[PDB]
Write a structure and sequence with these properties.
Two copies of one chain form a homodimer. Chain A is an alpha/beta fold. Chain A has three domains: 199 residues, P-loop containing nucleotide triphosphate hydrolases (Rossmann fold, 3-Layer(aba) Sandwich); 158 residues, Sulfate adenylyltransferase; 233 residues, Rossmann fold. Helices cover 38% and strands 16% of the residues of chain A. Chain A contains 21 helices and 20 strands. In chain A, the strands form five sheets. In chain A, strands 2-3-1-4-5 form a five-stranded parallel beta sheet, sandwiched between helices. A five-stranded mixed beta sheet of chain A has the order 6-10-11-12-9. Chains A and B meet through helix 1, helix 2, strand 2, helix 4 and helix 11 of A and helix 1, helix 2, strand 2, helix 3 and helix 4 of B. The complex binds adenosine-5'-diphosphate and adenosine-5'-phosphosulfate (3 copies). Adenosine-5'-diphosphate binds next to helix 2 and helix 8 of chain A. The PDB classes it as transferase.
Chain lengths: 590, 562
């Protein structure tokens, strides 16, 4: 005979044996058939073979030779309990839906199963007798108030409530979804139904009431000193932008992320950039062995990494796979090229909440804070715009036209998340303080509407990885509640440092994003290149036959205009926003 | 109530509704118990949910308040037939093992099934008031053939009535034009512009033609190229593993000349060998391609070096391959397509196929992996595991042992019986070798998945090589296996990963290496083998079969004469 654990490998797609019996009981019309039908549908929609035993299939076949003549009812239940045990033994979730009114017959069904090592879940579908008669779903209670039916349970014979059911469904105070969810959650607690990977925000901050204690704990551990870009990835993790990571990636997660751009355990989750912690040979041999250590930034213990695992940082290969180049003068690759040769994964418990105390912490909303803000503005669509640059009206055009399309589709309260990145950025980019001041101005001028625009700062370092990075950009906003993700040309790219051509082809970011796995709850809203049209005196989308109508105004052209004291053409950038830049460009030359 | 067709889709790893009842009847207890156990084993070995009702789970449970009166026995068999119905309706193959002596009773059990549109198979376990069935679907003579032959007869019947798939490997899409359309297609090819291709490109034309890259319809179009480089899979219409670009390159000159055209012919050695239809041209970004496929852009990597010499366009399209690819070098007999391999495995009556990709001479370390896989399968209840020894035959780097010499070596290894020729199919995989480690190992695996392998063996540093700059392992040696074991899109086969095997001095054989015995282990590389041949030494006894080593000294001698 084949073992259960072998039957578990071939019953269904998900591995592991999960045979068991979900035993529904309660009065006629309490809700058993309704629950079973819906529970079955849930299990099947999730790849879990199940079979339902009910009146339709038992009392009309196996049990056609029994009535409700209280011996018959014992024998009913007994035969059902035996069948159920055989389904459960075969590896199915067996759901049984019978009134099953005797406490002794149900316990017997329970012992038939516990005796052969099969889980048994007694679910009391509990509606007051008067409610069940209200529903009289099949016309039986009236057929029995008239006499014409037996000792119908609840009226003429007894129903004995279960004493310690695994779950009581109060079907007069909850809906069917409430029932299904309570049962499914039971089966998840008891390892019959797996908990699939989720994008539900998962912070890695310790709770405030556990915080003091965790700090004291942290103080006893070895420590590892981290730097600022590390502390900003500490923040990305803490706040949940890399949900469902539990900490810095372990080997397995790292390799998934680099080869497939996804995490794969428990379901496909897009996560296309390594979120890792590096260490030197020296730190590894020092910390390896220890079940916990603390991470220290600017002499403060900012987090604890528990159950840590050390694996090699193969850096040329990492770089080549993440960036499509191993060019040493790419500014992030250069940082990676200086780090250690080990990476460290583990479970990260972050302590004090991360504040940078620079005048900008009011913008640094967590994904929870952001979803609250949308809820409070009552948005019915959130479009997100990642940017790392001053907003010119070419960007504003992508934002305005996405806003138009949402309206045209029926949304009535579209909100724009204007989402500049504020983590590490390469040397020649405009500093965050300045870009925030510049977008404030675009908004003060009404190029974008302040009453429908949330402005906040995305804490991730920037990688400048093009079509790899953009997925990361997008998935982060997805976690924070965005339903539409605006993407133009060359997102996340830059010039190749050696050749000066674009590192990445300009349509790939979008093409890749639109077909990347894991990006299921948001729609990609992609755009062609916009540039200053000279005829119409505004930004518009570039067209082939009019190469000459269009001026492209580089970041180098702006630095140049500001310095020769001129102005970009009219329609390129909100005048006040422009001024902030001149102000920026002024302190730059020094 | 969820439908059969939907329960069907989730019951097994395989899909299709295949609920039914195999109803054994007859006197012989051992007959029925032996067959039903063995059927059960076979179904489970083959991914089909089943459940056996017999004395041991019915007698003392469901039918325990029944005794031997004629009514009680009638009822005994009624209750079993109803319960079997429930398992068949639930999508399981329900196997019933009771004497069930009377026609009335078996006829009723059938009717419970046929009246709910569930197949019922009355299998008469016949071995000399039992009432023999008048029209059973199978007569099993258990006294006169073995259990495995019986179980085969059942399995055949279940194949015939579409319960057990004839197949269930991934369906192969060949790109060859069917032979009835050839001469025509050859004529049509003659009217079109032509693009001359080289030998490596012709190898990939073969890879495509024969179906190894199923479901591509030809050289990769942009979207597929981007899926393959970013995600290691094709995604459109289902995730399947494909981690290496399968592409045709072109110069600026050739692109200009051909972009515009709706079909052109591929030309190898003056012969038109294919038409590419509805072509699209997209950039060959070499540096990025390289970096993402190989995890390095090292200009001296030998396949990277060829990609860097190719043109800056790629051409995707629908590929129709004309004459069968034959190389006329004395090895064509081993060049089996996925279709011919699947037929070869059927003809051998395999019930498990383990595939071993390789590019090197087989030492007894490799054989050990193969031998261990073959043991693991025996134990899991497979009874005719067949090994596909599948040397790669496409382009390989300059210092590798040539295909012909390897084939003759491999032939020596089977002649010494380190591998059994009777359970072993030797064939040549036609792909070029990329030397891309964990990225390429997925290509190696998927291609064999398409050829119907069920288990795919992988050891240390698969598809790797020394980094040409440092001589250090270009790849981390455990990665291939770690990546492969978790890679998406390879759901119809099992990966069997192995730790590194090396020569044990103390045991005088190849065994798995152990940290705390470092010293007993001798690692003999290709370099060391060539050094040893050149001084007239043999490697230790147990490392390589003698006749196979002698083939190698012949090879190393030929090198020396040059
Ligand atoms: N939360 C609930 N769970 C199940 N049924 C509910 C619930 N709330 C209201 N109902 C209604 O009560 C009725 C219960 O009917 P039925 O499932 O067939 O009961 P039973 O199988 O217990 O005889 C249905 O019409 C159902 O829609
Ligand atoms: N005597 C009765 N008491 C309760 N239900 C009855 C009775 N007679 C017929 N029925 C109907 O038979 C159906 C199935 O009852 P069961 O769940 O199988 O009862 S049980 O108590 O023996 O578990 C119910 O919808 C029920 O209304
Ligand atoms: N002028 C352009 N036309 C269309 N889209 C653009 C243009 N410039 C930038 N984008 C898009 O605007 C967004 C942000 O631009 P950037 O801030 O420069 O860099 S990125 O690193 O955030 O993309 C991305 O979607 C990017 O493709
Ligand atoms: N000594 C060894 N021990 C374990 N695995 C090995 C050893 N040598 C090679 N392998 C594995 O054997 C297979 C064939 O290896 P090779 O022919 O050297 O090269 S490969 O390119 O085809 O993988 C691969 O799965 C590889 O990982």
């Amino acid at each position: 005979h084949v073992s259960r654990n072998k039957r578990g490998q071939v019953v269904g797609t998900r591995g592991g044996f999960r045979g068991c019996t979900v035993w529904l009981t309660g009065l006629s019309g309490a809700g058993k058939t309704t629950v079973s039908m819906a529970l079955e549908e849930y299990l099947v929609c999730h790849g879990i073979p199940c079979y339902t035993l009910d009146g339709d299939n038992i009392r009309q076949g196996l049990n056609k030779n029994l009535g409700f003549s209280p011996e018959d009812r014992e024998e009913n239940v007994r035969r059902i309990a035996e069948v159920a045990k055989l389904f459960a033994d075969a590896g199915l979730v067996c759901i049984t839906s019978f009134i099953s009114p005797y406490t002794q017959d149900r316990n017997n069904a329970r012992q038939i199963h516990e005796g052969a090592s099969l889980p048994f879940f007694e679910v009391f579908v509990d509606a007051p007798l008067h409610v069940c008669e209200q529903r009289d779903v099949k016309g039986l209670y009236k057929k029995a108030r008239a006499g014409e039916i037996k000792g119908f349970t609840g009226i003429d014979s007894e129903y004995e409530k279960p004493e310690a059911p695994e779950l009581v469904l109060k079907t007069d105070s909850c809906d069917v979804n409430d029932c299904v969810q309570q049962v499914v959650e039971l089966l998840q607690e008891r390892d019959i139904v797996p908990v699939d990977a989720s994008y539900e925000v998962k912070e890695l901050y310790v709770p405030e009431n556990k915080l003091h204690l965790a700090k004291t704990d942290a103080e006893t551990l070895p420590a590892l000193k981290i730097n600022k870009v590390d502390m900003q990835w500490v923040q990305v993790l803490a706040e949940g932008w890399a949900t469902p990571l539990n900490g810095f990636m372990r080997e397995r997660e790292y390799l998934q992320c680099l080869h497939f751009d996804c995490l794969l355990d428990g379901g496909v989750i897009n996560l296309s950039v390594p979120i890792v912690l590096t260490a030197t040979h020296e730190d590894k041999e020092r910390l390896d062995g220890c079940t916990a250590f603390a991470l220290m930034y600017e002499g403060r213990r900012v987090a604890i990494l528990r159950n840590p695992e050390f694996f090699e940082h193969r850096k040329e290969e990492r770089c080549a796979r993440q960036w499509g180049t191993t060019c040493k003068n790419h500014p992030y690759i250069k940082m990676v090229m200086e780090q250690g040769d080990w990476l460290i994964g583990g479970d990260l418990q972050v302590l004090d909440r991360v504040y940078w105390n620079d005048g900008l912490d009011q913008y640094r909303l967590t994904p929870t804070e952001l979803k609250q803000k949308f809820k409070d503005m009552n948005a019915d669509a959130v479009s997100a715009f990642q940017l790392r640059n001053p907003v010119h009206n070419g960007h504003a055009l992508l934002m305005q036209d996405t806003h138009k399309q949402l309206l045209e589709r029926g949304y009535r309260r579209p909100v724009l998340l204007l989402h500049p990145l504020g983590g590490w950025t390469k040397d020649d980019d405009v500093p965050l303080m300045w870009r925030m001041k510049q977008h404030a101005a675009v908004l003060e001028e009404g190029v974008l509407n302040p009453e429908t625009t949330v402005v906040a700062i995305f804490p991730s370092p920037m990688m400048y990885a093009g079509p790899t990075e953009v997925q990361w950009h997008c998935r982060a906003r997805m976690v924070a509640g965005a339903n539409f993700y605006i993407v133009g040309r060359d997102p996340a790219g830059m010039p190749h440092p050696e050749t000066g051509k674009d590192l990445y082809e300009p349509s790939h970011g979008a093409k890749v994003l639109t077909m990347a796995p894991g990006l299921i709850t948001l729609e990609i809203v992609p755009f062609r290149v916009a540039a200053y049209n000279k005829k119409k005196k505004r930004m518009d989308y570039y067209d082939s036959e009019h190469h000459e109508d269009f001026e492209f105004i580089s970041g180098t052209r702006m630095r140049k205009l500001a310095r020769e004291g001129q102005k970009p053409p009219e329609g390129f950038m909100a005048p006040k926003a422009w001024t902030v830049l001149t102000e920026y460009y002024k302190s730059l030359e020094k």
